[PDB]
Design a protein around this motif. Structure first.
Motif, PDB file in Angstrom:
ATOM      1  N   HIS A 167       4.569  -0.842  13.535  1.00 56.99           N
ATOM      2  CA  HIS A 167       3.580  -0.329  12.597  1.00 56.99           C
ATOM      3  C   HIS A 167       3.548  -1.231  11.373  1.00 56.99           C
ATOM      4  O   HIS A 167       4.601  -1.565  10.825  1.00 56.99           O
ATOM      5  CB  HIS A 167       3.925   1.109  12.208  1.00 56.99           C
ATOM      6  CG  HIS A 167       2.820   1.835  11.510  1.00 56.99           C
ATOM      7  ND1 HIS A 167       2.590   1.723  10.155  1.00 56.99           N
ATOM      8  CD2 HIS A 167       1.904   2.718  11.973  1.00 56.99           C
ATOM      9  CE1 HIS A 167       1.563   2.484   9.819  1.00 56.99           C
ATOM     10  NE2 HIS A 167       1.128   3.099  10.904  1.00 56.99           N
ATOM     11  N   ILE A 168       2.348  -1.638  10.953  1.00 60.39           N
ATOM     12  CA  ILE A 168       2.157  -2.602   9.871  1.00 60.39           C
ATOM     13  C   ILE A 168       1.176  -2.020   8.860  1.00 60.39           C
ATOM     14  O   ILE A 168       0.174  -1.409   9.249  1.00 60.39           O
ATOM     15  CB  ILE A 168       1.634  -3.952  10.406  1.00 60.39           C
ATOM     16  CG1 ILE A 168       2.615  -4.567  11.387  1.00 60.39           C
ATOM     17  CG2 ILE A 168       1.435  -4.964   9.301  1.00 60.39           C
ATOM     18  CD1 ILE A 168       2.072  -5.784  12.044  1.00 60.39           C
ATOM     19  N   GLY A 169       1.459  -2.203   7.569  1.00 58.60           N
ATOM     20  CA  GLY A 169       0.493  -1.902   6.529  1.00 58.60           C
ATOM     21  C   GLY A 169       0.352  -2.988   5.477  1.00 58.60           C
ATOM     22  O   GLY A 169       1.353  -3.452   4.928  1.00 58.60           O
ATOM     23  N   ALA A 170      -0.881  -3.406   5.195  1.00 56.74           N
ATOM     24  CA  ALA A 170      -1.185  -4.353   4.128  1.00 56.74           C
ATOM     25  C   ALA A 170      -1.856  -3.634   2.968  1.00 56.74           C
ATOM     26  O   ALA A 170      -2.834  -2.912   3.166  1.00 56.74           O
ATOM     27  CB  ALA A 170      -2.107  -5.464   4.627  1.00 56.74           C
ATOM     28  N   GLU A 171      -1.365  -3.866   1.754  1.00 56.47           N
ATOM     29  CA  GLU A 171      -1.843  -3.147   0.583  1.00 56.47           C
ATOM     30  C   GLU A 171      -2.779  -3.998  -0.263  1.00 56.47           C
ATOM     31  O   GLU A 171      -2.598  -5.208  -0.404  1.00 56.47           O
ATOM     32  CB  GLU A 171      -0.684  -2.656  -0.277  1.00 56.47           C
ATOM     33  CG  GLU A 171       0.032  -1.481   0.335  1.00 56.47           C
ATOM     34  CD  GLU A 171       1.145  -0.949  -0.535  1.00 56.47           C
ATOM     35  OE1 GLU A 171       1.489  -1.607  -1.539  1.00 56.47           O
ATOM     36  OE2 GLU A 171       1.672   0.136  -0.217  1.00 56.47           O
ATOM     37  N   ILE A 172      -3.787  -3.333  -0.829  1.00 54.66           N
ATOM     38  CA  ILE A 172      -4.898  -3.966  -1.536  1.00 54.66           C
ATOM     39  C   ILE A 172      -5.158  -3.172  -2.807  1.00 54.66           C
ATOM     40  O   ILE A 172      -5.353  -1.955  -2.742  1.00 54.66           O
ATOM     41  CB  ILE A 172      -6.178  -4.014  -0.681  1.00 54.66           C
ATOM     42  CG1 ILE A 172      -6.043  -4.989   0.485  1.00 54.66           C
ATOM     43  CG2 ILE A 172      -7.392  -4.349  -1.518  1.00 54.66           C
ATOM     44  CD1 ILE A 172      -5.629  -4.357   1.772  1.00 54.66           C
ATOM     45  N   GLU A 173      -5.167  -3.843  -3.956  1.00 56.44           N
ATOM     46  CA  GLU A 173      -5.565  -3.223  -5.212  1.00 56.44           C
ATOM     47  C   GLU A 173      -6.972  -3.653  -5.597  1.00 56.44           C
ATOM     48  O   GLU A 173      -7.322  -4.830  -5.499  1.00 56.44           O
ATOM     49  CB  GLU A 173      -4.603  -3.581  -6.340  1.00 56.44           C
ATOM     50  CG  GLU A 173      -3.279  -2.890  -6.236  1.00 56.44           C
ATOM     51  CD  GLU A 173      -2.325  -3.283  -7.339  1.00 56.44           C
ATOM     52  OE1 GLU A 173      -2.660  -4.203  -8.107  1.00 56.44           O
ATOM     53  OE2 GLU A 173      -1.241  -2.673  -7.444  1.00 56.44           O
ATOM     54  N   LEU A 174      -7.771  -2.690  -6.043  1.00 58.92           N
ATOM     55  CA  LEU A 174      -9.112  -2.943  -6.545  1.00 58.92           C
ATOM     56  C   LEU A 174      -9.226  -2.349  -7.938  1.00 58.92           C
ATOM     57  O   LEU A 174      -8.837  -1.201  -8.156  1.00 58.92           O
ATOM     58  CB  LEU A 174     -10.173  -2.339  -5.626  1.00 58.92           C
ATOM     59  CG  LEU A 174     -10.258  -2.948  -4.229  1.00 58.92           C
ATOM     60  CD1 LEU A 174     -11.205  -2.156  -3.363  1.00 58.92           C
ATOM     61  CD2 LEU A 174     -10.699  -4.392  -4.312  1.00 58.92           C
ATOM     62  N   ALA A 175      -9.771  -3.123  -8.871  1.00 62.17           N
ATOM     63  CA  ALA A 175      -9.790  -2.720 -10.270  1.00 62.17           C
ATOM     64  C   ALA A 175     -10.821  -1.623 -10.519  1.00 62.17           C
ATOM     65  O   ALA A 175     -11.834  -1.513  -9.827  1.00 62.17           O
ATOM     66  CB  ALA A 175     -10.087  -3.917 -11.166  1.00 62.17           C
TER      67      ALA A 175
END
Lengths: 49, 49
Positions: free
Chosen positions: B25-33
């Protein structure tokens, strides 16, 4: 009775001010008159009419 | 192999092999302003917007 304008004057940052507004962070009112006096008529003295 | 020796005769053999599936199981995290979100919904008409 009087007779004036009916709408606001429209000033918008078009294609030449918009490059200096993005990149330099400074824009100017009516770029086309500044360019048509510095390079097109560099020796034109400021007359009134 | 068919032998003719003094031991008991050769019987056929089965082996039961149990293959499973490992899960990864893999998760990639992304921040958006939050000021970047707000002008995605906003109405725009001028060439700087």
């Amino acid at each position: 009775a009087m007779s004036g304008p009916a709408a606001y004057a429209s000033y918008v940052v078009r294609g030449a001010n918009l490059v200096t507004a993005v990149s330099y962070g400074r824009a100017m009112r009516n770029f086309e008159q500044f360019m048509a006096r510095i390079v097109d008529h560099p020796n034109a003295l400021p007359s009134v009419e | 192999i068919a032998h003719g020796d003094g031991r008991r005769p050769n019987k056929q053999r089965q082996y039961i092999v149990m293959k499973a599936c490992n899960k990864h199981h893999i998760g990639a995290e992304i921040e958006l302003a939050a000021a970047d979100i707000e002008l995605l919904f906003a109405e725009k008409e001028t060439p700087l917007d």
